[PDB]
């Protein structure tokens, strides 16, 4: 049991080192395999797409301070370091939705308080490194056991709603900027309507190709390969559509050529922690701990829940693991990295399972067709190292990246926020609220609890989400991570009195 | 058995009369019921929409000679007469796709041969009446038994393809007329992407609403009501969308006010058979027999097959049938009706099944549940007569019909041509050409015949369709009705030699 209080300082980390690094030769020896070559392209595309789209969003929101070049460099550096000297090489590192929300909230708060956006970031990172060291030294990584399904589903639903809502707003802004009138440019014909066509065309191509994977058409070998290319194909089709129309203006993303620093007129490659243009107030270096705690919660929750999912007994990963070394490495890198600008990164649970699923080799089954035994996972470090290097050497092609319309990306930004709602039991219980009770499916949380006591759980769980959404839209949007972890004590004491022990074994089951 | 050669000249007509007319009182007495009032609005909408859309097509195709007013008047008159003095009033009379194709072909032939378009139509009408009388007097209505599934599926697939192809052509023409350029009107900003948005929006609203009917969401009573409103809701939504945009130009269908004659500057309410402006040639009054035969086949094939489907043993219609009287009434009416302009009409199989479904009464189920026994159908004359009189008094609201965009209608033209492909066994066998043989469904024509002998039948059936489509795209696109019935002799003599008896009982089964 990795999550056990040994009692010695840095005990868990030392145990992770001693049970992981002795195998530093097999991780490089197991590189020679066609499966690795097949997976290195799929995961490379799956990591590049939510790098350019998130960089575009961040460049628009952060007033062209952190753009596409910065996020790509950060992803490349952190991925290379983590894969080279980490403990779970299958765990990919990438920018996430909650981090984007927190960054825009911090930017708004800093703007509405006359401070400098990139000077307080360095102090946030400085406090974050110390906080991570203190948490690792006291063996506090066992707290992940206290986060049940009641919180993860709420958080996932909130993030999906944010993704969905950050696209209709952009459409509304485009129609307000380029109105439909008879005969930043600020008013062009055939621009507000091509944008609507462009992101609707790319959402439906990618949606239907994903639906084509699960279908029974075509041989299984060809169907599986094409199905994995749902997003890369959708971008390629719609870029060629806009390339043919050369007389109409459409907004395109901005990638500086070479190794520039995203409009080098407001920022340099090195940020002065003491002050750039005006003295930094004395009260914003010893009171920069409260924001450091809130950002630490998001990184801790994303990075540790993902390790639980990938280390489940269903997946036969027997080489070692990491629960203390991985957290110390990720958080301490972000604090040092924030000195040079650049954003913080966390582990991505959607891309990590895809990375692992592309490396497992199934067994044979003379028995009727099912999901057979999973012998070996072919775990290694070579596959994850090359991908982080390939994303790094994607800024030399900035000439081709500058031809991608901004509307094409927002179509996928909506696709990623709507196909992420599957598997969320909070989402499935929402359909059951409309279906007649005779049509409900045969699931564990249906037969063991009567329906009137099942809708009360959903209403209580949905009430919390509305309350947390409202906080994020006020002037105190910086404090929403605190409310997120405030639901865990609620389930310990409040739900226990109102719900019997019988109910809270099928609704909250972690299996 | 109505289809039996009695031997007397007008045997079938008198046989139908003496078993249909004596109970004239019951057909009017059975009117008082809420089912009729519920079904009348549904069938009214289902008959009105493919009258305005077909009139919109016909106005453009026929150079504003037969438009929307004429088609509505023809539908109203023929419906009233048929429902008043005809057998089996459950039939719904309406303009069909094959008739539209034939009228377009005849218009092209008349244009490319210096003849007038509405003068030869009257002679075709007289000849059509003569052959209807001759056909009925010789008891030739039993020939419908010789048309098997091999011909009906080909005909349906060809019509659906024509419907689909008559929309992308219109989109291409709009985009060539209103090109995308920087800053009949013949060139306006926007008004080319709006048309693409308008017909894509109305196709998806109607498509998803139909998919909502089969779902398990919502109470059963509410689901079926708004489920039947797939098309009327889709039109209402997209008209309100184009009403808000008042600065952009969108093409709208032309409905003359009052009882005008669709631009009465080139036509009158009466047509001179001997000539309007120039002496009509002597060699198109005795050689209009060939077009009269060809149009007779379409009316004969479409009308009689519909009666068989409605009078199947599954539907408990035992009140009397009209295999003989209906054909004489419909065909002879069109010949007289063509004297006053106006188009020919035939019974519609899609709206006839829907009309019967809306009046049937299911029974209770002691068993766990299936489609129970059908107790009574409530066949009558009042329901069909009111609808024909309600479509007729829809030209007084021509001010409201003039605000419907022409792009909204073509969205439903494509919807009708794609949801009509279900139930066609020729369409279902086309999917099986791509599925792996392990995934084929549990269907009768799958296990009894090996797969390699099943794809030969589909390829032979598909080869005929391509040959029939080729003749329709040439300058001799008038003999395609003749080629259509030429498939029946092919199956009698040619296919039976190459296929064993075992195969031609599951592929060609009529049950």
Numbering used by the authors:
A (entry chain A), B (entry chain B): 673 to 855, 893 to 1220
Task: Please give sentences taken from the publication describing this entry.
Anion exchanger 2 (AE2) works at high cellular pH to catalyze the exchange between the intracellular HCO3− and extracellular Cl−, thereby maintaining the pH-homeostasis. Here, we determine the cryo-EM structures of human AE2 in five major operating states and one transitional hybrid state. Among those states, the AE2 shows the inward-facing, outward-facing, and intermediate conformations, as well as the substrate-binding pockets at two sides of the cell membrane. In conclusion, given the presently revealed structural models, the AE2 uses NTD as the intracellular pH sensor to mediate the anion-exchanging activities of its TMD, thereby maintaining pH homeostasis.
To further explore the conformational changes of hAE2 upon the cellular pH shift, we conducted EM studies on hAE2 at basic pHs and determined the structure of hAE2 at a pH of 8.32 (hAE2basic-KNO3). The 2D and 3D classification showed that the image signal for the NTD turns poor in the basic environment; thus, only the TMD of hAE2 was well solved and modeled. Two major classes of particles were sorted after the 3D classification, and upon the map refinement and structural modeling, two EM structures of hAE2basic-KNO3 were determined as homodimers in two different conformations. Similar results were observed when hAE2 was purified in a NaHCO3-free solution of pH 8.32, and AE2 deprived of chloride/bicarbonate at basic pHs in two conformations (hAE2interbasic-KNO3, hAE2outbasic-KNO3), with resolutions of 3.25 Å, 3.09 Å, respectively. The co-existence of the hAE2 in the intermediate and outward-facing conformations at basic pH indicates a more flexible TM arrangement of AE2 upon the pH elevation, which might result from the disengagement of the TMD and NTD. Along with the elevated intracellular pH, the loopTM10/11 is dissociated from NTD. It lifts towards the membrane region, which loosens the interlock between TMD and NTD and allows sizeable conformational change in TMD, especially the TM helices involved with NTD-TMD interlock at acidic pH, i. e., TM1 and TM10. When the cellular pH raises along with the acid secretion, the pH shift-induced conformational change, possibly in NTDs, would release the loopTM10/11 from NTD to allow the helical re-arrangement in TMD, resulting in the removal of loopCT from the inner vestibule and thus allowing the access of bicarbonates to the substrate binding site (“ready to load” state, hAE2interbasic-KNO3).
